[PDB]
Amino acid sequence: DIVLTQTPLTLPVSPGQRATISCRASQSVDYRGYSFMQWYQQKPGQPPKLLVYWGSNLESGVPARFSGSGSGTDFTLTIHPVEPEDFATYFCQQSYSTPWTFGGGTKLEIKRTVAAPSVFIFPPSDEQLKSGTASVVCLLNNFYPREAKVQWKVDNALQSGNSQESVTEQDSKDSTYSLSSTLTLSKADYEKHKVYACEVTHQGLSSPVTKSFNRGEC
């Protein structure tokens, strides 16, 4: 097995700047002038796209700001200038000897100015409460950078273990993230307390923002 180690694992870079991803093979991938190393770009919810084949052949239809290079073991994909659409995970792949193998991947974030989230809290629907459960949704909307903390409190008790959050992919349109934390309770537990709150911590906020409601009130 030709093990491909790809570094760095993540990488944030500004538009216009140079981004350099590298891939090191456990042994040589070469025969004569040719190095059998490929580069793929996977934007999320989509199949990989071939960028460079055989070391340094820029795939037709791909812009010249992408270019691959290297020999033997050490290969590098460079992007210059980086652009907001270049958000993606990039993968090296070797086709010299079976089994064919990919790298672990490198996740390219785009940089931009700091943007605070707009926080919204959503109580559970009367709809849902009729069944077994109560779901409470806190939404952090259009923020940069990705690092944010959400903390649920129910009658002043910090919740943990019963919250689950997911985050959108970087907007490219404006390069922000958005994030939803969803607190889940039994109907019983939900009617046993009054005050529900998410406190959001984030870099663009000068101190943490809290959005809350009291059960019952409009």
């Binding site: 793929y40 199949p47 990989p48 084949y53 993968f91 990919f102 949704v137 959108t168 969803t182």
Partner: protein, 214 residues
């Protein structure tokens, strides 16, 4: 164009088998092998199988060796990946790829979900706005469905701006859940209606939920 169409995915029992297919158009270059690559949920790319340009020599990942059969029908311009004794570690989006040099043409992918869990349609609840700033936010919660995927548009696709549809989350119950939200002008809450269109194909569930304040 030079397209690849991937069929035969879906929900399968542990220990059962799958047979995926891949149809093509106009290439037919003859120096180009056929690959299967998979992607486990939330992970990177993993090579699965390969059949060489001329038939002779196939090849497999050690994870799948013994359990998989890759074949190609030159007449129908179509390749197959049969795989047996499936486990939950085979649950992934199976990609079909082809080309000379690298893997230049890909199919859109096909999810195979190895689980003895039952197919279950989602319940769709509103994320109702205030009742107050200057801009309102509203959404739909799609709870307790299995397997993936689920599809959310707004106003039959007529409303795309301000929409964030979040990645699904596997709950402790083993059922999935996701939220889709949209930010809109608060002045237009009185006038315009906002309906999220949910579709969970696996369960034949197709729901329109209107979202208003209260």
């Amino acid at each position: 164009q030079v397209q690849l169409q991937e069929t035969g995915g879906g929900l399968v029992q542990p220990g059962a088998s799958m047979k995926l297919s891949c149809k093509a158009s106009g290439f037919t270059f003859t120096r180009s092998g056929m690959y299967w690559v998979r992607q486990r949920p939330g992970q990177g790319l993993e090579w699965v199988a390969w059949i060489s340009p001329n038939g002779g020599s196939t090849d497999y990942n050690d994870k799948v060796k013994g359990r998989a059969t890759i074949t190609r029908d030159t007449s129908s311009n179509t390749a197959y990946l049969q795989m047996s004794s499936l486990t939950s570690e085979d649950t992934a989006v199976y990609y079909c790829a082809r080309g000379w040099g690298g893997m230049r043409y890909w199919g859109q992918g096909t999810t195979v979900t190895v689980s003895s869990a039952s197919t279950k349609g989602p319940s769709v609840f509103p994320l109702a706005p205030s009742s107050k700033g200057g801009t309102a936010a509203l959404g739909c919660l799609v709870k307790d469905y299995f397997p993936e995927p689920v599809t959310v548009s707004w106003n039959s696709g007529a409303l795309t701006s301000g929409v964030h549809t979040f990645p699904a989350v596997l709950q402790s119950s083993g059922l999935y859940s996701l939220s889709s939200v949209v930010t809109v002008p608060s002045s237009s809450l009185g006038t315009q209606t906002y309906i999220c269109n949910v579709n969970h194909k696996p369960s034949n569930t197709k729901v329109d939920k209107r979202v208003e304040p209260k």
